[PDB]
Scaffold this active site. Structure first.
Site, PDB file in Angstrom:
ATOM      1  N   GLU A   1     -13.860  -1.458  -3.590  1.00  0.00           N
ATOM      2  CA  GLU A   1     -13.099  -1.426  -2.356  1.00  0.00           C
ATOM      3  C   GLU A   1     -13.679  -2.244  -1.258  1.00  0.00           C
ATOM      4  OE1 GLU A   1     -10.313  -0.016  -2.009  1.00  0.00           O
ATOM      5  OE2 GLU A   1     -10.175   1.175  -3.855  1.00  0.00           O
TER       6      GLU A   1
ATOM      7  N   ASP B   1      -4.477  -3.494   2.994  1.00  0.00           N
ATOM      8  CA  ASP B   1      -4.933  -3.511   1.614  1.00  0.00           C
ATOM      9  C   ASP B   1      -4.081  -4.469   0.785  1.00  0.00           C
ATOM     10  OD1 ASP B   1      -2.627  -2.091   0.894  1.00  0.00           O
ATOM     11  OD2 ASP B   1      -3.633  -0.285   0.167  1.00  0.00           O
TER      12      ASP B   1
ATOM     13  N   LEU C   1      -7.047   4.779   2.921  1.00  0.00           N
ATOM     14  CA  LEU C   1      -5.678   4.482   3.366  1.00  0.00           C
ATOM     15  C   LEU C   1      -5.276   5.262   4.604  1.00  0.00           C
ATOM     16  CD1 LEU C   1      -2.814   3.236   2.932  1.00  0.00           C
ATOM     17  CD2 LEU C   1      -2.257   5.349   1.803  1.00  0.00           C
TER      18      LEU C   1
ATOM     19  N   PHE D   1      -8.611   7.592  -7.182  1.00  0.00           N
ATOM     20  CA  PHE D   1      -8.920   7.172  -5.811  1.00  0.00           C
ATOM     21  C   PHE D   1      -7.975   6.070  -5.367  1.00  0.00           C
ATOM     22  CE2 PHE D   1     -12.222   6.984  -2.426  1.00  0.00           C
ATOM     23  CZ  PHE D   1     -11.988   5.728  -1.864  1.00  0.00           C
TER      24      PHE D   1
ATOM     25  N   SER E   1      -1.551   7.100 -21.991  1.00  0.00           N
ATOM     26  CA  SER E   1      -2.960   6.688 -22.023  1.00  0.00           C
ATOM     27  C   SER E   1      -3.857   7.885 -21.963  1.00  0.00           C
ATOM     28  CB  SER E   1      -3.335   5.835 -20.839  1.00  0.00           C
ATOM     29  OG  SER E   1      -2.470   4.734 -20.698  1.00  0.00           O
TER      30      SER E   1
ATOM     31  N   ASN F   1      -2.991   0.249 -23.819  1.00  0.00           N
ATOM     32  CA  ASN F   1      -1.958   0.971 -23.108  1.00  0.00           C
ATOM     33  C   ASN F   1      -2.168   0.934 -21.593  1.00  0.00           C
ATOM     34  OD1 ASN F   1      -0.560   3.880 -22.151  1.00  0.00           O
ATOM     35  ND2 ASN F   1       0.495   2.922 -23.868  1.00  0.00           N
TER      36      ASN F   1
END
Ligand SMILES: [Cl-]
Ligand SMILES: [Cl-]
Length: 162
Positions: A11, A20, A32, A104, A117, A132
């Site tokens: 990040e 972002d 966020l 996250f 998955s 996948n």
């Protein structure tokens, strides 16, 4: 390596409000603020989060405090989710970090949607799971980060981050 260092690499760290990859207002270590198009709305969210009249700028210490809270929230969201919890319980420590990373970035809901998955992870069918996971908007929009996370999930090592 660990979850915090891992996410700090993915990040980055910014002390002023920024947008972002999806165009949303964010701050610190991928925290966020709002999906709204308004800077003011973002500024109000920031102040509310930090507890002070910020002027859109925070300190490193403030950024780390939000990050701790966010990591904690991500883990707690996994453990509270009926679809995620069992997966998480079934994995080793490095792979658990990969699942935290995904939650996250995309939220619990988002992740809970990788039904297939998840079922493969649970079965420990690593290569099939990795293929996948790649068939997703997630992979196509942020391929390098996705590759790093998928490699971690697949191999159970930190090689993608060293
Ligand atoms: Cl918050
Ligand atoms: Cl990327």
């Amino acid at each position: 390596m660990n979850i915090f260092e891992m996410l700090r690499i993915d990040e980055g760290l910014r002390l002023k409000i920024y947008k972002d990859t999806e165009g949303y207002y964010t701050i610190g270590i991928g925290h966020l603020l709002t999906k709204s198009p308004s800077l003011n709305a973002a500024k109000s969210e920031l102040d509310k989060a930090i507890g002070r009249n910020t002027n859109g700028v925070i300190t490193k210490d403030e950024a780390e405090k939000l990050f701790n809270q966010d990591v904690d929230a991500a883990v707690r969201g996994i453990l509270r989710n009926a679809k995620l919890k069992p997966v998480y319980d079934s994995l080793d420590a490095v792979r658990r970090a990969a699942l935290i990373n995904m939650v996250f970035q995309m939220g619990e809901t988002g992740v809970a949607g990788f039904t297939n998955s998840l079922r493969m992870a649970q079965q420990k069918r690593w290569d099939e799971m990795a293929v996948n996971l790649a068939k997703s908007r997630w992979y196509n929009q942020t391929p390098n980060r996705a590759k790093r996370v998928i490699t971690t999930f697949r191999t159970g090592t930190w090689d993608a981050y060293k």
